[PDB]
Design a protein around this ligand. Sequence first.
Ligand SMILES: CNS(=O)(=O)Cc1cc(C)on1
Length: 191
Amino acid sequence: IKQGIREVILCKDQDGKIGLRLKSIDNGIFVQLVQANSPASLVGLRFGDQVLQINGENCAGWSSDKAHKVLKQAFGEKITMTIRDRPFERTITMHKDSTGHVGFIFKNGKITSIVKDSSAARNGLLTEHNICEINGQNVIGLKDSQIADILSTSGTVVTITIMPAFIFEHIIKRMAPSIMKSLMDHTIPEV
Ligand SMILES: CNS(=O)(=O)Cc1cc(C)on1
């Protein structure tokens, strides 16, 4: 969660795509899906990110639909965006013990308990929070087993980005878990 507003410059691909779906939330506009191998994944857009401006025009109060139209009607050449970094999320750094545990239970990407005298507990991890990212990789809609795999194959230090479930549920409104398994970019960023 980078403290402030940054600017990104996008460029439609050969197919006129940027790779983005956006959701209206509390009169802001927020990133709902980022597509693998897309302009939006290259420039580093993330689920949860707020779009402040599109080409210098303010997004406040737009509907998802208007946001999507604005994007279609734009000269592919160069689309600027003003981004606030994942405003609804926090990042929690934890350390695995010698058993390789951090100390929580989660179900359907949702944390549901903290284990006494874990790092998770020492670190104030919260239940009723959806796991958005692990070690900077988006994990939304992967099966629980594959999240365990990512935690299990991780270094000792584990960084998790979480979002209040009521907010999370508002963003992904009416989506299958396997929709986002398919569509959401789950790669480590290129350098
Ligand atoms: C895969 N379909 S989508 O338009 O790209 C994102 C979305 C929004 C809602 C509601 O359900 N899915």
